[PDB]
Design a protein around this ligand. Structure first.
Ligand SMILES: O=C(O)CNC(=O)C(=O)O
Ligand SMILES: [Mn+2]
Length: 546
């Protein structure tokens, strides 16, 4: 109770230091946070790190939102018991002082956070190694009031920026709508502490993938609202911003009646000729269709390899490989030009896409609000029009050309066709009544989606003929190697609310799934070390039975 303050850098007890830091936090951007260098008695934090290395057993865990080496899974034996620190006397001593009344009075003062629990200790020990990463979130959970992270990388070697592993902070386009791109990045050093008041809809942050083979050791923790009466405490003393929307447009009367008349290999020579512009002969033949109809009835899932025929396989691979290798892919949302859009918000997803709508770039509230007041629909042929006219001005350089976008839009127009939707209904024996089609590109080190359910159309809920499901399709057009372990991410993951599908990115595949209310999907975050983007074509349809 006396030697506590002495286990800190004496500067934090200095009134001048305190009042100076308080203001630094008040006026910080993009939301109120702060950092202190050399927080703790160096020989202690050195003792603590030698303890963690000696005694604690880290276990990789990957989910949609992170990959991190964890020590916290209790009910795994290796799980760290904070109720038993017999062999981590210096860690015990660390927790004691971070939650001391001495430190809490300081730390609460500078952060204008009010009272902070000393009895509700809440700490965890993680390492991030090559590939590890934690996507965007605001920390808003239960009674967390202030977040803090104490860094213990190798104390005798400075952590470098190109290592990755940075604390990134996202600014607010408007509340619960953080800008896709981070506006500040903290390269952590030993005995450094990052911290912020937990703020619903604002404190969005992440941990940049660790790119090299080093060990980023941290102690994340939280200060909580006091227990009721603790040191005198008394209590009390959006889908509209998601882009793309998970919406489909109903099909014409022409289209639907076709799929009905058919279901109540009945395609013409002509229709088969159309379908074979794009689809491999192997999936147009009688045997090949019975083979797929059977699969679908059994699994309510198709996973087709070599979907497209070789003419279109060679074409797409070429133009996709050309763009990968000879053009500057944009790595900030401001840089994305027509026909591409950046999916937002980053605590839900981040990827590049073509939706055939008029061009949006969302840097401001007014950008989001201008689009909401002016909802507009896809038109791919007009999108092609727009591109050629831009692509004539500049000149179709090895570096500036739109060949990929044009081949892919052509592929989307195929899949938009009446006839494909006939072929589809033939495969599945379902009548599509709606569609949404997207071209998606997931960039190394930036793009991901997160585990979500399908979204039923509210207007068609009361319809007995429409299946309480969503038919979802994914044509993957990723031409690079090394995805196969999951290690690079990019994989399409279908699981239940146990895993239905787990397909790393591959070339010219087509997955097809009928999702009921409860199925979760996500494309995993793509590693910085991936050798290309994941390219694909996402297709969603409401369906009805015939
Ligand atoms: O280690 C870091 O810098 C960030 N950690 C977190 O944001 C978290 O654990 O929720
Ligand atoms: Mn966090």
């Amino acid at each position: 109770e006396d030697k506590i303050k002495g286990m800190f850098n004496p500067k934090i007890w200095d009134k001048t230091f305190q009042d100076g830091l308080k203001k630094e936090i008040e006026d910080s951007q993009p939301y109120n946070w702060g950092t202190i260098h050399e927080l703790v008695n160096d020989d202690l934090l050195r003792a603590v790190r030698k303890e963690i290395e000696t005694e604690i057993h880290f276990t990789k865990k990957e989910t949609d939102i992170y990959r991190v080496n964890q020590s916290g899974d209790l009910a795994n034996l290796s799980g760290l018991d904070w109720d038993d620190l017999s062999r981590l006397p210096n860690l015990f001593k660390l927790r004691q002082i971070l939650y001391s009344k001495q430190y809490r009075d300081f730390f609460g003062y500078v952060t204008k956070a009010g009272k902070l629990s000393g009895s509700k200790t809440d700490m965890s020990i993680n390492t991030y190694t090559k590939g590890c990463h934690l996507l965007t979130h605001d920390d808003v959970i239960g009674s967390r009031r202030i977040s803090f992270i104490l860094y213990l990388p190798d104390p005798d070697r400075k952590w470098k920026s190109h290592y990755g592993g940075g604390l990134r902070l996202f600014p607010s386009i408007l509340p619960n709508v953080p800008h896709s791109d981070p506006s500040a990045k903290l390269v952590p050093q030993f005995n450094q502490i990052a911290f912020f008041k937990v703020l619903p809809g604002f404190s969005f942050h992440d941990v940049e993938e660790v790119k090299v083979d080093k060990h980023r050791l941290s102690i994340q923790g939280w200060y909580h609202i006091p227990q009721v009466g603790e040191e005198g405490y008394i209590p009390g003393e959006l889908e509209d911003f998601e882009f793309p929307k998970d919406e489909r447009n109903i099909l014409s009367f022409h289209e639907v009646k076709h799929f009905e008349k058919m279901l109540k290999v009945k395609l013409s020579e002509a229709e088969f000729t159309y379908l074979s512009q794009y689809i491999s002969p192997e999936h147009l033949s009688s045997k090949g269709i019975e083979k797929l109809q059977k699969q679908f009835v059994e699994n309510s899932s198709l996973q087709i390899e070599s979907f497209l025929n070789d003419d279109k396989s060679e074409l797409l691979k070429k133009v996709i490989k050309q763009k990968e290798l000879e053009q500057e892919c944009p790595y900030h949302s401001k840089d994305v030009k027509a026909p591409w859009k950046t999916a937002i918000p980053p605590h839900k997803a981040r990827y590049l896409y073509i939706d055939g709508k008029e061009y949006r770039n969302f840097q401001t509230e007014a950008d989001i609000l201008e689009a909401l007041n002016n909802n507009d629909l896809p038109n791919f042929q007009f999108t092609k029009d727009a591109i050629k006219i831009i692509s004539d001005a500049s000149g179709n350089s090895r570096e500036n050309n739109f060949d990929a976008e044009l081949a892919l839009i052509d592929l989307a127009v195929f899949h938009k066709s009446t006839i494909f939707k006939k072929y589809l209904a033939l495969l599945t024996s379902l009548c599509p009544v709606s569609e949404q089609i997207l071209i998606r590109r997931f960039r190394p080190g930036m793009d991901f989606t997160l585990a979500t359910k399908c979204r039923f159309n509210e207007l068609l809920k009361s319809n007995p003929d429409i299946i309480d499901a969503v038919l979802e399709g994914t044509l993957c057009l990723t031409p690079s190697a090394g995805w196969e372990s999951g290690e690079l991410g990019g994989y399409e993951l279908y699981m239940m609310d146990s895993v239905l599908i787990n397909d790393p990115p591959a070339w010219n595949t087509f997955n097809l799934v009928l999702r009921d209310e409860s199925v979760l999907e996500f494309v995993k975050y793509v590693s910085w070390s991936a050798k290309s983007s994941r390219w694909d074509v996402k297709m969603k349809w409401d369906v009805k039975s015939c």
